[PDB]
Amino acid sequence: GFTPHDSAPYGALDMADFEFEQMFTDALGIDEYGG
Amino acid sequence: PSHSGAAIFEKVSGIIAINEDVSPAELTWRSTDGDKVHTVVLSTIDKLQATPASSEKMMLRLIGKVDESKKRKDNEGNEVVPKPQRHMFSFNNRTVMDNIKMTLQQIISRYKDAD
Numbered sequence: 001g002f003t004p005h006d007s008a009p010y011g012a013l014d015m016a017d018f019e020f021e022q023m024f025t026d027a028l029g030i031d032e033y034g035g
Numbered sequence: 036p037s038h039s040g041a042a043i044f045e046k047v048s049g050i051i052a053i054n055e056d057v058s059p060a061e062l063t064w065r066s067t068d069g070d071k072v073h074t075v076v077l078s079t080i081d082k083l084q085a086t087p088a089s090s091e092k093m094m095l096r097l098i099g100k101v102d103e104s105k106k107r108k109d110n111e112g113n114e115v116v117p118k119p120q121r122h123m124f125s126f127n128n129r130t131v132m133d134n135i136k137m138t139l140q141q142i143i144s145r146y147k148d149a150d
Contacts, residue, residue: 017123024096024123027086035148 038138040131042094044073044124051124051131053138060142062097062135064124075122077146083139085132093132096123097139 038053044064051064061076085095102116126132
């Protein structure tokens with residue numbers, strides 16, 4: 001027995017993931033040539 | 036430490052441990068000593084994103100795979116998959132990133148090749 005009493009995934013809002021995801025969008029040029 | 040390294044998760048200094056020995060192959064991370072834990076399995080994540088070598092940020096984020104062409108139906112017919120869930124964490128060592136990155140690259144490739 002174990003039920004969640006507190007949990008708010010949408011409680012920690014931050015716009016850092018946006019600017020952070022930008023520097024986190026395809027940062028590798030080792031694509032193409034095969035698979 | 037080809038499958039182990041130290042990385043900051045949830046903006047909280049910690050360490051990472053890769054479980055490539057297990058069939059599902061997953062990456063488990065825990066705080067440095069904050070009785071905290073964070074584990075992710077490819078089964079939910081089928082992509083990893085890391086920074087360039089020239090950079091000095093040493094960090095990578097993993098995607099919680101999307102069903103752009105695997106979505107399920109409900110009744111409307113549009114059949115779409117909920118909003119994907121990805122995670123992002125930073126490294127604190129040159130080998131730590133490459134050791135695991137090279138690891139995830141294979142596993143991701145494994146789960147990416149199957150699909």
